[PDB]
Amino acid sequence: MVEPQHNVMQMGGDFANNPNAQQFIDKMVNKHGFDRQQLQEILSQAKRLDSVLRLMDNQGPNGAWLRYRKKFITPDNVQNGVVFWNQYEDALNRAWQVYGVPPEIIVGIIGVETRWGRVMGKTRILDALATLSFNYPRRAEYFSGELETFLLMARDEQDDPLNLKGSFAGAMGYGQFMPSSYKQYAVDFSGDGHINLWDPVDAIGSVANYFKAHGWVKGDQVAVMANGQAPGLPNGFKTKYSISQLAAAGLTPQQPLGNHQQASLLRLDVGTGYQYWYGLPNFYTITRYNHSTHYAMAVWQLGQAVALARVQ
Template sequence: MKICWLALCLFSLTAGASVSPERLAELASQQQVPLAALQDATAKAQLRQEILDTIARPWEAKPWHRYRPLFVTPERIRDGLAFWQRHAALLTQAEQAYRVPASVIVAIIGIETFYGRQMGRHSVLDSLYTLGFHYPERSDFFAKEFAQLVLLAREEKWPLTSLKGSYAGAMGMGQFMPSSYRHYAVDFDGDGKRDLFANPADAIGSVANYFAEHKWRWGEPVVEPALIGLAPVSTLLTLGPEFSQQWQELAAAGIELAAPPAPDTPVKLLALEQADGPEYWVARHNFYVITRYNRSPLYAMAVHQLSQAIQDAYALQPQTSSPQPDLVAGRL
């Protein structure tokens, strides 16, 4: 009996851990997915303890001085330069079509998957099943993505159990969640399909489209270092990625910038922990756009700083042709 009980426990942790019929019916109605398709997907999915363990230790929980070295590295800069050189024509096309800098597109792909080399080893189906139905903290979000995965697989004619991605269910070179894949992925090379796994053209165009759809503003700053003086910093820091301040509020408190924006410009004061104390930055609209990809300000700052480093490296390379003057991705 003890052996049978242990086997039953093991089975419940790996396959077929039940989801209530009511929950599936509600999800099917909300996401407009056939109930039978959801039932079939849950029957094929497995509960993975590894996924629950991993999401409990997010990299974004690290302080900035330990987070930054994970992503802004000489190797990632070097390989980002090589990726840009290899796909220069595609990146120029993406800049022209979407008004999003090549440096930002390259940095996103670099941070997410090391330029397509590390796209994830987890079953996307299992990841989203585990987090959608067995991770109460964010179950609503991941259950929605589970339903979106079912729709996406039907649309793209993918076998559900073959898809690999991150522990959180993100896929492809740019690590799109299923809902983002459905809504923002583009067939950038016009071959009749959207392939973010093996087609750099579609990955580049899709990342650019994502940023354009979230209102990236060409030529505007992303974030600027701030001098705080005697400003009451603790009262000016706000939770969440949303911008609830205007520059005039920070300026009145004593914050200084080298190039202050207009008084009514939406901004957000950031404090990033270095080993010897916090450093302060004032984020602008484009910083907020990066947080639409990942809500963490650490992630957004890493994307920005990697993009700048890659851009600087690219600017030092001999150019074979002259880009249109207004489309040069200058320092943003």
């Protein structure tokens, strides 16, 4: 009837003689009450993907921004964004009221991440996370905690750990949430009692709660383009200068900056020249989702493009 299989201490597969996997299995049993044998049967099925290890290692004015921008802001993309927006308008409006996060931001995020559920990932999450946990010393501790949370997530949502697919880093669903983002930020916005990252309505609320959690200020400006040039000052979303300093570099806000006394100096390579922007706090909040100036500007502008295509 019952098969304890205590004597089956050594598993097969790609992580068969892996010290890191054996340590992991011990932590899950001890700390979470997992059954060693059941876990071994799972991890023995996990694959060591060289592509995942190669991709994590892989990570003027020549028109940099334009090449990045046109990867997302195209007629076909803006049109699908309109459809997704109108289809999930109730969830989008409800998220605005509860979280203060606007529709165009959530639409832009889901748009750039998975093109609205069209490109969600083809790699099994266990393979990716197990590969980066047991064969990648550089980020092994970070990905171990992600595999840990993933296993617990698959247990809490009654998911079979092997049926779930996503990115090469183990990101999941419409919003490409990492296992730790699911734990800390995902919410049951659809109200069915479950938190599905692959459910459009849950994805919307979770992306909204993520933003609020990271300080998104309702109605506050995201960024404001500047008149003038400032080649002497360093730039990017991590920079920090006062409005007085920026003004001294020869800049001025194309729109009133409110009460803001500081901003980051963003610079977009528009081919013919450089375009400077006053990066406000809401812009930074976007980068907390994906640490990149280009990402954040692409998310915002994509949402803006879709906002206009609905107006018409």
